[PDB]
Design an enzyme around this catalytic site. Structure first.
Site, PDB file in Angstrom:
ATOM      1  N   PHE A  29       0.823  -1.203   0.000  1.00  0.00           N
ATOM      2  CA  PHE A  29       0.000   0.000   0.000  1.00  0.00           C
ATOM      3  C   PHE A  29       0.860   1.256   0.000  1.00  0.00           C
ATOM      4  O   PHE A  29       1.813   1.414   0.790  1.00  0.00           O
ATOM      5  CB  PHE A  29      -0.932   0.010   1.206  1.00  0.00           C
ATOM      6  CG  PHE A  29      -1.784   1.239   1.293  1.00  0.00           C
ATOM      7  CD1 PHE A  29      -2.825   1.427   0.431  1.00  0.00           C
ATOM      8  CD2 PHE A  29      -1.479   2.257   2.173  1.00  0.00           C
ATOM      9  CE1 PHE A  29      -3.585   2.583   0.475  1.00  0.00           C
ATOM     10  CE2 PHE A  29      -2.232   3.431   2.187  1.00  0.00           C
ATOM     11  CZ  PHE A  29      -3.251   3.589   1.318  1.00  0.00           C
ATOM     12  N   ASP A  84       4.516   3.353 -19.586  1.00  0.00           N
ATOM     13  CA  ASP A  84       3.439   4.261 -19.202  1.00  0.00           C
ATOM     14  C   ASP A  84       3.792   5.084 -17.973  1.00  0.00           C
ATOM     15  O   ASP A  84       3.032   5.200 -17.034  1.00  0.00           O
ATOM     16  CB  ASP A  84       2.116   3.501 -19.014  1.00  0.00           C
ATOM     17  CG  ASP A  84       0.891   4.431 -19.047  1.00  0.00           C
ATOM     18  OD1 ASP A  84       0.907   5.465 -19.745  1.00  0.00           O
ATOM     19  OD2 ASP A  84      -0.043   4.336 -18.236  1.00  0.00           O
TER      20      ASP A  84
END
Lengths: 6, 297, 258
Positions: free
Chosen positions: B83, B128
């Site tokens: 996270f 990307d």
């Protein structure tokens, strides 16, 4: 093409 | 399995699913769960997810977002990621008055370059890189994320997918339809992001391919056989292209110092074979004083 | 891009050892043999031609099959389903435009259903634990090619050809790592077309010599000489094409002088 099967 | 995870809230949303923040009831670890809907009679496991998982299991690096686990049921596919609090974009949006302190910029770029050199060293192109795909935690780390457009490359490269990189961060050689592209396209993107963290606005916000090209040309000069041997023979080069003169770099990103300017010009070099590699960029004098400041929030 | 060329080659040398199948798995396979394996891989070559897939895609699929069969017993009647799924996973990993699932069901002349192929994709992914980015012979050759002086297309295509042939015959090629089969193939190709040999720059790079390559080379030279009489022929047919400068029509050397 089918191989080892009938 | 999922029995050990307790969902806390929605974070974001990907292409074949949604991301949740969740906690491990047993260890206490907090994570991001990226669900992937499979069904059947479909086309099976999406090829993006094939690539994301296989490549991400080979990239263990403090500046690449860690894939902790894959929970792979008959019905669904769960990707469990470490996270991270935020992304670089939703963070510049919060840093208007106070732009981003140079030190923090320097720490970020330096961490980004480390992450990217690892990828390239393990034959992976990200393809990307842009601020929403760079995550930050409360301890001042930044990390590359979202490898769903990535691919394992070969030495030397073949011709890969042409439709690649979010327009604003897309490299000239892709815009000009080159047969081959490689690691340099990721460097182009970082350089765009470098300039972005500084000015706080996209460097080349084009709305089409040709608009994107033309913006790049008006900033860096229209390239010729001199600056970029081969250009005029590339598939989407047009002899009609306007010839704009190259600007002084001090004008591209005025707040930048001599070392900053130096590094940026090497990241935004036209000829991919000469654009700096991430590895070589780690040693640039721009980073001589570098540290890992925690975000001033 | 020599900035990462050495880092990449070193990493692939690490991974080929981790991704290597079990050499003696065929023995533990109750209902299948090297010959049947040979039929399947020869068929996958055909599929790869029907759909114009990259050679890399073929290599990866074979890697997947061999790793899957290293731990899962399979009935003969399901070998082609494992193969089909492996080719679909390989295509999804490596191809810009992979063929659609319906096309893979169709190439098995509806031996299997779409649902079967899809379920076999999941199990294959599970058995391989999503570790699809495996090194191939192909990946190593392509690096070795940068060492020709000057480049020679025929050498390149004959090396690929030879490398492809090594996919067909688990005995003995399962014994050898991709980097080593590449070395033998490159040297064999070069010797055959130009009479040159395994270059010193590749010794420096790989640590391999003609001495260390000898065993694989000896097998590979026999395979190359016996190739017109092998029961499987799809690779020779393939490489008779112009894409590959017809290198299957070249004559193999009667001796290697080693």
């Amino acid at each position: 093409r089918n191989l080892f099967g009938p | 399995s999922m029995e050990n995870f307790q969902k806390v809230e929605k974070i974001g949303e990907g292409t074949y699913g949604v991301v949740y923040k969740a906690r491990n009831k047993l260890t206490g670890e907090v994570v991001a769960l990226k669900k992937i809907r499979l069904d059947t009679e479909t086309e099976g496991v999406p090829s993006t997810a094939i690539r994301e998982i296989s490549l991400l299991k080979e990239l263990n690096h403090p500046n690449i977002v860690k894939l902790l686990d894959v929970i792979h049921t008959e019905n669904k596919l769960y990707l469990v990621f470490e996270f991270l609090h935020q992304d670089l974009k939703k963070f510049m949006d919060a840093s208007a008055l106070t732009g981003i302190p140079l030190p923090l910029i320097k720490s970020y770029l330096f961490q980004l370059l480390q992450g990217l050199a690892f990828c390239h060293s393990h034959r992976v192109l990200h393809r990307d890189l842009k601020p929403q795909n760079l995550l930050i935690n409360t301890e001042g780390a930044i990390k590359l994320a979202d490898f769903g457009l990535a691919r394992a490359f070969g030495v030397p490269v073949r011709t890969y997918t042409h439709e690649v990189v979010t327009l604003w961060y897309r490299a000239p050689e892709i815009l000009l339809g080159c047969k081959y592209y490689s690691t340099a396209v990721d460097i182009w993107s970082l350089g765009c992001i470098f300039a972005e963290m500084v000015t706080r606005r996209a460097l080349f916000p084009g709305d089409s391919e040709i608009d994107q090209l033309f913006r790049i040309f008006r900033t860096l000069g229209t390239p010729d056989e001199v600056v970029w041997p081969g250009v005029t023979s590339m598939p989407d080069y047009k002899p009609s292209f306007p010839k704009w003169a190259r600007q002084d770099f001090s004008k591209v990103v005025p707040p930048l110092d001599e070392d900053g300017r130096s590094l940026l010009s090497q990241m935004l070099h036209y000829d991919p074979n000469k654009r700096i590699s991430a590895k070589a960029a780690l040693a640039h004098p721009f980073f001589q004083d570098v540290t890992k400041p925690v975000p001033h929030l | 891009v020599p900035d990462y060329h050495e880092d990449i080659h070193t990493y692939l040398r690490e991974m080929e050892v981790k991704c290597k199948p079990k050499v003696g798995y065929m023995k533990k396979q109750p209902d299948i043999t090297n010959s049947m394996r040979a039929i399947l891989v020869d068929w996958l070559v055909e599929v790869g031609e029907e759909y114009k897939l990259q050679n890399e895609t073929l290599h990866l699929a074979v890697n997947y099959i061999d790793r899957f069969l290293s731990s899962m017993s399979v009935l003969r009647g399901k070998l082609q389903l494992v193969g089909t799924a492996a080719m679909l996973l390989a295509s999804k990993f490596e191809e810009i435009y992979p063929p659609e699932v319906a096309e893979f069901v169709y190439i098995t002349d509806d031996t299997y259903t779409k649902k079967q192929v899809l379920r076999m994709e999941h199990l294959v992914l599970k058995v391989l634990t999503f570790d699809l980015a495996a090194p191939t012979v192909n990946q190593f050759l392509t690096q070795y090619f940068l060492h020709q002086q000057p480049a020679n297309c025929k050498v390149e295509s004959l090396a690929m050809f030879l490398g492809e042939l090594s996919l067909i015959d688990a005995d003995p090629y399962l014994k050898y790592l991709p980097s080593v089969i590449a070395g033998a193939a490159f040297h064999l190709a070069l010797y055959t077309v130009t009479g040159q040999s395994w270059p010193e720059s590749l010794i420096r790079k790989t640590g391999y010599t003609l001495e260390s390559l000898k065993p694989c080379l000896m097998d590979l030279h026999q395979t190359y000489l016996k190739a017109p009489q092998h029961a499987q022929q799809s690779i020779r047919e393939k490489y008779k094409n112009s894409k590959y400068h017809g290198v299957s029509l070249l004559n193999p050397p009667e001796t290697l002088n080693l």
